[PDB]
XYZ file of C-alpha atoms in Angstrom:
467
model
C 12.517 44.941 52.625
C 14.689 47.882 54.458
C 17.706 45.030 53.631
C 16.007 44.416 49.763
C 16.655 48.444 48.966
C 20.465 47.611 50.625
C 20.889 44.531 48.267
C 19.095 46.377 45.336
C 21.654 49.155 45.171
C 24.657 46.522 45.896
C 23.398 45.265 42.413
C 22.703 48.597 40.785
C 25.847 50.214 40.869
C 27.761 46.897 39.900
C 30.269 47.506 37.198
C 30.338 44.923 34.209
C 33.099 42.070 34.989
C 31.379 42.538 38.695
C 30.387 39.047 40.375
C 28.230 39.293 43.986
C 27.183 36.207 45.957
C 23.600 36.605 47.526
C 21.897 35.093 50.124
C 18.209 35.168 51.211
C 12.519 36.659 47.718
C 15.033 35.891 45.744
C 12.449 36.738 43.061
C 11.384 39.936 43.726
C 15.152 40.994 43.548
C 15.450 40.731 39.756
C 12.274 42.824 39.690
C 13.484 45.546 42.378
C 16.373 45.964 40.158
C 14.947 45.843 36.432
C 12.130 48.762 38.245
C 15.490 50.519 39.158
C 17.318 50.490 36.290
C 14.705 51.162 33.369
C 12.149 48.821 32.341
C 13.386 48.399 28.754
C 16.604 47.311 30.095
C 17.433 43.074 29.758
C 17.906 41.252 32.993
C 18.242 37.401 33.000
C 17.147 34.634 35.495
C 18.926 31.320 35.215
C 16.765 28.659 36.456
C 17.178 25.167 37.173
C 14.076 23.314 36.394
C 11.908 24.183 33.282
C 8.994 23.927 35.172
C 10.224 26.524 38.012
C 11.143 28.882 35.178
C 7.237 28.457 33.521
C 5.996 28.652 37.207
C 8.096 32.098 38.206
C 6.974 33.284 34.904
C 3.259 32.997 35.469
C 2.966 34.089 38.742
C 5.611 37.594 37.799
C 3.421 38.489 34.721
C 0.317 38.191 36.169
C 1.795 39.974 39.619
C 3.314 42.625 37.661
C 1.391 43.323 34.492
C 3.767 46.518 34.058
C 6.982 44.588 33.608
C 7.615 43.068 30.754
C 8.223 39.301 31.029
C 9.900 36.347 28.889
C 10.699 32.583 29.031
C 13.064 30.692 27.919
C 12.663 26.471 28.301
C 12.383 25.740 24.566
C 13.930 26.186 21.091
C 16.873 29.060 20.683
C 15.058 32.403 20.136
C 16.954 33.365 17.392
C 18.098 37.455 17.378
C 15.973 37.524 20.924
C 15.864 40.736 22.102
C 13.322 40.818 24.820
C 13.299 43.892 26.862
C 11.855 42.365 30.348
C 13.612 40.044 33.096
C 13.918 36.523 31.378
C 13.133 33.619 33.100
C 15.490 31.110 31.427
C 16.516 27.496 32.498
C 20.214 26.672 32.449
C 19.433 23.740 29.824
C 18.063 26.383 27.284
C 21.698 28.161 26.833
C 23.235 24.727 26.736
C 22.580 25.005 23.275
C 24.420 27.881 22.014
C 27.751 27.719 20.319
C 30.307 30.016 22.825
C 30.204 32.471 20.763
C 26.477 32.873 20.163
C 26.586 31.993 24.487
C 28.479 35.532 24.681
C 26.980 37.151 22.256
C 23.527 35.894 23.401
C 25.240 36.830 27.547
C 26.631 40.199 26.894
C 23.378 41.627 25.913
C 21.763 41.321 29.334
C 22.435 43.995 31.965
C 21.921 41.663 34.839
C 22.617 37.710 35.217
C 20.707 36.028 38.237
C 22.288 32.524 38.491
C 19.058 30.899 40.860
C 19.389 28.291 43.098
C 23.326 27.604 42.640
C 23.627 25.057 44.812
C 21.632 22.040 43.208
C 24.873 22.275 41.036
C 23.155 20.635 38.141
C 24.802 19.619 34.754
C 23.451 22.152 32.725
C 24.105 24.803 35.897
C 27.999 23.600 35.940
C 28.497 23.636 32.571
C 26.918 27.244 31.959
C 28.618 28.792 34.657
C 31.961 27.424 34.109
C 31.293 28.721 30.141
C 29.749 32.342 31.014
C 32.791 32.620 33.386
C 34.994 32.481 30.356
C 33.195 36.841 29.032
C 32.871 37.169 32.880
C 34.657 40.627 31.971
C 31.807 41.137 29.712
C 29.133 40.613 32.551
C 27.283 41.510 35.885
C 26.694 38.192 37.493
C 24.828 37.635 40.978
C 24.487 34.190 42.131
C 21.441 33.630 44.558
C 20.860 31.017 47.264
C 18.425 30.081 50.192
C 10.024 26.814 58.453
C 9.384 25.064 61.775
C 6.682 26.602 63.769
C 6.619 24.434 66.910
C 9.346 22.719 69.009
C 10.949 19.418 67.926
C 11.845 16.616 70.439
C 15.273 15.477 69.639
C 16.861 12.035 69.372
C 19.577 10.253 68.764
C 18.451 6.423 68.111
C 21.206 4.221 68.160
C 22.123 1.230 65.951
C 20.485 -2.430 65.901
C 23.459 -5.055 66.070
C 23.116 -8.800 65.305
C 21.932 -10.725 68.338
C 19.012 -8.451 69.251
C 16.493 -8.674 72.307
C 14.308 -5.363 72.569
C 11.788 -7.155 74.569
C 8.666 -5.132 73.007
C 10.022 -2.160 74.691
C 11.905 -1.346 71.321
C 12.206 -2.212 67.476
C 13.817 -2.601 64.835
C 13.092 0.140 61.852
C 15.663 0.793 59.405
C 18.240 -1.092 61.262
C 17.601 2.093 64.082
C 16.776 0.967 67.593
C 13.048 2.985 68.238
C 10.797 2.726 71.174
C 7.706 0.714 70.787
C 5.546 3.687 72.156
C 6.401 5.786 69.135
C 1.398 5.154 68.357
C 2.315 8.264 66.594
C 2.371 8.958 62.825
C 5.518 8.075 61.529
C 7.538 9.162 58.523
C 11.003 6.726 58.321
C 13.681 8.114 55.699
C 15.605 5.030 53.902
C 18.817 5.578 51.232
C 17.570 2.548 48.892
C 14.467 2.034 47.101
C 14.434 -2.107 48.474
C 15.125 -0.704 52.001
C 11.672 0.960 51.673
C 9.661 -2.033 50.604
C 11.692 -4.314 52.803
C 11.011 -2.325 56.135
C 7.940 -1.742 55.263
C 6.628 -5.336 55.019
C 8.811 -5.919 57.948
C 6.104 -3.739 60.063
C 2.758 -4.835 58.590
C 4.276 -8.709 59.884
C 4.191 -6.899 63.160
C 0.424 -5.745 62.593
C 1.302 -1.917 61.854
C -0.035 0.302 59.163
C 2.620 0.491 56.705
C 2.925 2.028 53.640
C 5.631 2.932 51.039
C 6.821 5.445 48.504
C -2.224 7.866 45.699
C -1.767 4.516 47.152
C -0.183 6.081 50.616
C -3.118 8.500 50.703
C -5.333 5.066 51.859
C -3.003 4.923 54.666
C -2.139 8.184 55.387
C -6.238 8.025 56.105
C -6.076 5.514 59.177
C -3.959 7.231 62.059
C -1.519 5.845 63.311
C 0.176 5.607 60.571
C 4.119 4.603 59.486
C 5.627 5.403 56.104
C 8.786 4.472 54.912
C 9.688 6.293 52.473
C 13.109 7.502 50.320
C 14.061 11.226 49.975
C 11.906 11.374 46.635
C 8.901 11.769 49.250
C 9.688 15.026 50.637
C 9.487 16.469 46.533
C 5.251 16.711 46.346
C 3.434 13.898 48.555
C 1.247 16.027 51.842
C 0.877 13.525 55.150
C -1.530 13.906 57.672
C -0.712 15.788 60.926
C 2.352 13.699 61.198
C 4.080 13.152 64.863
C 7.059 11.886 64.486
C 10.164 11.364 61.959
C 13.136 8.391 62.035
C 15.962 9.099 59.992
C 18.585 6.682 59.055
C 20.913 9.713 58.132
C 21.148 7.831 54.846
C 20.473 8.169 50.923
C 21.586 6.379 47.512
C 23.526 8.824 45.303
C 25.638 9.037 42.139
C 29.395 8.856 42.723
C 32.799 8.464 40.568
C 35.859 6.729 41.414
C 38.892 7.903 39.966
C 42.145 5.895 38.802
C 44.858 5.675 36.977
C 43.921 2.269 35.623
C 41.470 2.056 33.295
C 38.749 2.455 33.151
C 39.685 5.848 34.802
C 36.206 6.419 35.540
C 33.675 4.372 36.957
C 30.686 5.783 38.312
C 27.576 4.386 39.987
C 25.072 5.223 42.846
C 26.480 4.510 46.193
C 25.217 4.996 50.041
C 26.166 8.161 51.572
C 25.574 10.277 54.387
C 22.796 13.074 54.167
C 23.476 17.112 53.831
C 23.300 19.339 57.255
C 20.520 21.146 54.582
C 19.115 17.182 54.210
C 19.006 16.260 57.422
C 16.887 19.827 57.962
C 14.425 19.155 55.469
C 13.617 15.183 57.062
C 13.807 16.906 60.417
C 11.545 20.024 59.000
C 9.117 17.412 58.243
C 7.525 17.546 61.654
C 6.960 20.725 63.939
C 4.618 22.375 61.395
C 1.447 22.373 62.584
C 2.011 20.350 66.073
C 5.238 19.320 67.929
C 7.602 16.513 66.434
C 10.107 14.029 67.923
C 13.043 13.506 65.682
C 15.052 10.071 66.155
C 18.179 10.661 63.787
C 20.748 7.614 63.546
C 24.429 7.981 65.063
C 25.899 9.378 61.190
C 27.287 12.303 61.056
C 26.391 14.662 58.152
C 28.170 16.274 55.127
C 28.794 19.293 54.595
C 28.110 20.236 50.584
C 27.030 17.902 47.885
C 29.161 15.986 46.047
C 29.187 17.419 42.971
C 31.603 15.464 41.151
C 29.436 13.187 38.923
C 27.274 16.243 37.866
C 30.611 18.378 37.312
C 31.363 14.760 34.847
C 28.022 14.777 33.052
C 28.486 18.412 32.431
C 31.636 18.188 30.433
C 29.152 17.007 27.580
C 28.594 20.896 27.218
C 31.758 21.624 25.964
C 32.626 19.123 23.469
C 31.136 20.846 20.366
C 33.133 24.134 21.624
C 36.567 22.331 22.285
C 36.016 23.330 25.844
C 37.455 22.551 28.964
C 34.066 22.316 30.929
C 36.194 21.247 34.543
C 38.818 23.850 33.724
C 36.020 26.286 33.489
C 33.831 25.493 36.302
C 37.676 25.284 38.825
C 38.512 28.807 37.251
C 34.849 29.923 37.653
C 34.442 29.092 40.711
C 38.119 30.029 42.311
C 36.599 33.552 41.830
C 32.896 33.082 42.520
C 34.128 30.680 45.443
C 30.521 29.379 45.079
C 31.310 25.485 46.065
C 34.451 23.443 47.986
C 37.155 22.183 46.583
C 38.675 18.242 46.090
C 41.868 19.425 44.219
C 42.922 15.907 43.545
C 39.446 15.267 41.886
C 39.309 18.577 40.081
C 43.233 17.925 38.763
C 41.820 14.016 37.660
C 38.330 15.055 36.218
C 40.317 17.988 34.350
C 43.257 15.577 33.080
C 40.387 13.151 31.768
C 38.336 16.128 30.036
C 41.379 17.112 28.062
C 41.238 13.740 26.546
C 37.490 13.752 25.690
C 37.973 16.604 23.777
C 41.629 15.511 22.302
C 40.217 14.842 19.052
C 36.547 15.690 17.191
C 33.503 12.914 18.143
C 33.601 10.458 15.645
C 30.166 11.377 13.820
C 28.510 7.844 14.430
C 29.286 8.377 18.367
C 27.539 12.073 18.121
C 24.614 10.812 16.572
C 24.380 7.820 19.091
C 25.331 10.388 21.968
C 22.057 12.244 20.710
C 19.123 9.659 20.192
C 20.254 7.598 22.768
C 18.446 6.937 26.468
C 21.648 6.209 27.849
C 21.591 7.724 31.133
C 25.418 8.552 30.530
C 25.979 9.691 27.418
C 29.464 10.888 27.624
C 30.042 7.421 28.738
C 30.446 6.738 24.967
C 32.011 9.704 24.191
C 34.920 8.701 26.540
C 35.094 5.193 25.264
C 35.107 6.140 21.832
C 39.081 6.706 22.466
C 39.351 3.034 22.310
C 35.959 1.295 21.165
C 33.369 2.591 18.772
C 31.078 -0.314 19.676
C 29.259 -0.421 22.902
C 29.077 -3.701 25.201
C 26.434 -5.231 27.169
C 27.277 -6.221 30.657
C 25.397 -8.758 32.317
C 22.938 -7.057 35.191
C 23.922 -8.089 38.641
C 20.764 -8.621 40.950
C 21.910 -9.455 44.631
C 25.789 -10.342 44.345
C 25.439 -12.649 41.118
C 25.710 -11.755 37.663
C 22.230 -12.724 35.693
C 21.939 -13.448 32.053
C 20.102 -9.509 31.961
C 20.906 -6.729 30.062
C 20.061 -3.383 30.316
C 19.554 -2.335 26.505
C 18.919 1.397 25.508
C 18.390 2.706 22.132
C 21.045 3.444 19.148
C 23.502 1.488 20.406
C 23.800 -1.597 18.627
C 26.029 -3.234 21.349
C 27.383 -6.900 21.971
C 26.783 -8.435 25.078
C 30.345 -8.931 27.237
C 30.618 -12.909 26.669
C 34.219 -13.254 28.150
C 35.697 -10.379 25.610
C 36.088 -7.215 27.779
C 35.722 -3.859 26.245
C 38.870 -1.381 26.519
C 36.983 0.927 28.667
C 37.653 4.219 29.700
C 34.017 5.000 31.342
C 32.516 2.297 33.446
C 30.221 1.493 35.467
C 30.460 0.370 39.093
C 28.292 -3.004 37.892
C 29.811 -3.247 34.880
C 33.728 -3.140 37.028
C 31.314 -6.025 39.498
C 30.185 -8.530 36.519
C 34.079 -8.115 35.409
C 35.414 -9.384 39.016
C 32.740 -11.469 39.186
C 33.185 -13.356 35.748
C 37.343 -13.373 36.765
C 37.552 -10.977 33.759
C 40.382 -8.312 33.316
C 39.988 -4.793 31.688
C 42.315 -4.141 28.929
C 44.906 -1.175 29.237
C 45.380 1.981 27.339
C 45.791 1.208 23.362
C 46.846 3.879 22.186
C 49.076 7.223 23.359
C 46.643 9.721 24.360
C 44.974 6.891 26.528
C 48.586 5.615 28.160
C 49.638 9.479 28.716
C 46.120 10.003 30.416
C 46.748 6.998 33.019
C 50.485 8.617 33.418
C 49.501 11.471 34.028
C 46.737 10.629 37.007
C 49.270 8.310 37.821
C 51.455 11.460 38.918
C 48.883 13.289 40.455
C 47.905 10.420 42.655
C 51.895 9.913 43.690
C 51.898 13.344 45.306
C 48.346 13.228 46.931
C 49.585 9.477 48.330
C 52.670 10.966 49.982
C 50.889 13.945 50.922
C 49.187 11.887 53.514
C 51.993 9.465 54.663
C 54.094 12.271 56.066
């Protein structure tokens, strides 16, 4: 572009401990400025999916046989030295030692940090950690198509003690007019709602589908599918007409305390991005017009990053590293993402204790052959039990006599002896209610000087907001 050759020397005269924030292909950049400063200079593109690195990587060297090109997504590259631009994913510098990180870092000319904004574990960790030699670098961090007009709606609610005399219905508890014969595309936040809804329509003799098996009704117009945000990611529909949007999705959250367990995490019904909401809108108005009935929920603004910033603290244990210190003093000068202070102060309080003392060796072994989706869980709880518990599975509102078991563990199942927990679960905090169970309290110092010490924070936050 006339703006690219504007951008590209914005970049190119960047001093080292230089950080720029870029908005707009965000692919061609890296090459406009490896062309500009030699060839046989380093540049590095931080990626957060392998298979976006692999794909980028392709399509460059075969675009630009001229320009020497290298990928990252596997084992360390030991002494690497690869003149091109490499494509690397976050994940593959996740594991590096700090120092090998800088030393690895400080040998680039240029760091692109891609796609910023998906604020991944692997993404959080590395920038809050590169941060740390940001002296020592030249960082830019990069960041982001209707084609005919959109009808739009505002559908409201469905309350108990319901008429709609077949003039409306009710789809995904969103009151809809039964004219809307089009091809319809309803987002849902659960995976149940989807099936649930879905039968729900068929009852009422419409062609209903859920998410190939859709392509056989994607085939027969008109056509409804109700489907979760997971169907925007590949799935193509048919010259779709319109799009109902509960303004909902299911997403991982933590709750903070100063009882413990301190953390508890577990998915939880939220309110879409502005950014979210665009892409279900963006669904329709592609190739024909779209109507676009959105419920009466009012959108975020940013993601909540909070359980990925949690995950991510995994990253620094080996290195004694702070990885929410890091990522609040990496971002209060890249000013990349918002702020929850009182979150940041609790999830930073908690990370000095994970790293406290060195991982007992049984729980880093564990930690890595395990399936555990939460790995750090049993880091955490380590402070107080080396052996992990099986909580009964709660299907509906009643606990079951089913356990989730993943590998490595060699866990008990609860009984009626609850585990001193740090880390928990939303369902495992449930089956403890449930059972009329208690969780223990802090056993030992570091653990009661943790709970003070949120205990403090939350005091001030509290009377913050009485007045």
């Amino acid at each position: 572009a006339t703006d690219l050759t504007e951008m590209v020397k914005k970049i190119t005269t960047m001093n080292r401990g230089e950080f720029r924030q870029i908005t707009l292909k965000t692919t061609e950049l890296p090459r406009s400025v490896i062309e500009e400063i030699g060839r046989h200079k380093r540049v590095l593109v931080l990626i957060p999916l392998r298979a976006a690195a692999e794909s980028v990587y392709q399509y460059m060297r075969q675009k630009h046989p001229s320009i020497a090109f290298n990928l990252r997504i596997g084992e360390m590259k030991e002494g690497d030295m690869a003149t091109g631009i490499t494509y690397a994913s976050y994940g593959y510098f996740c594991q590096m030692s700090q120092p090998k990180l800088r030393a690895a870092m400080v040998e680039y000319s240029f760091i692109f940090l891609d796609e910023y904004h998906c604020a991944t574990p692997e993404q959080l960790a590395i920038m809050g950690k590169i941060h740390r030699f940001s002296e020592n670098l030249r960082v830019v961090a990069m960041t982001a198509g209707q084609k005919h007009p959109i009808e739009e709606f505002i559908a409201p609610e469905v309350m108990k003690g319901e008429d709609l005399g077949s003039e409306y219905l009710d789809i995904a508890g969103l009151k809809i007019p039964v004219e809307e014969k089009n091809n319809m595309l309803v987002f849902v936040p659960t995976r149940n709602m989807a099936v649930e809804a879905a039968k729900k329509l068929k009852a009422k003799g419409y062609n209903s589908g859920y998410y190939s098996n859709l392509r056989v009704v994607t085939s027969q117009s008109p056509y409804v599918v109700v489907a979760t945000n997971a169907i925007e990611s590949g799935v193509t529909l048919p010259d779709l007409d319109v799009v109902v949007d509960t303004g909902l999705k299911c997403e991982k959250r933590i709750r903070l305390s100063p009882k413990m367990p301190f953390i508890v995490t577990g998915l939880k019904r939220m309110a879409v991005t502005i950014g979210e909401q665009a892409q279900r809108r963006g669904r329709v108005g592609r190739v024909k017009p779209g109507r676009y009935y959105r419920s009466q929920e009012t959108p975020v603004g940013s993601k909540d990053y909070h359980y990925d910033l949690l995950q991510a603290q995994r990253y620094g244990i080996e290195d004694g590293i702070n990885i929410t210190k890091s990522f609040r003093e990496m971002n209060y000068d890249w000013s990349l993402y918002e702020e929850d202070s009182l979150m940041i102060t609790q999830l930073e309080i908690l990370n000095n204790l994970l790293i406290s003392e060195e991982l007992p060796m049984a729980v880093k072994n564990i930690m890595a052959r395990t399936d555990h989706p939460e790995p750090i869980k049993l880091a955490y709880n380590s402070y107080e039990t080396q052996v992990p518990v099986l909580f009964p599975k709660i299907r509906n509102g009643e606990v079951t006599d089913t356990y989730d078991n993943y590998t490595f563990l060699n866990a008990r199942k609860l009984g009626d002896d609850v585990p001193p927990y740090v880390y928990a679960t939303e369902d495992e905090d449930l089956a403890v209610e449930l059972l009329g169970l208690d969780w223990p309290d802090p056993g030992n110092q570091g653990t009661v000087e943790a709970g003070r010490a949120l205990k403090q924070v939350v005091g001030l936050s509290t009377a913050e907001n009485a007045l």
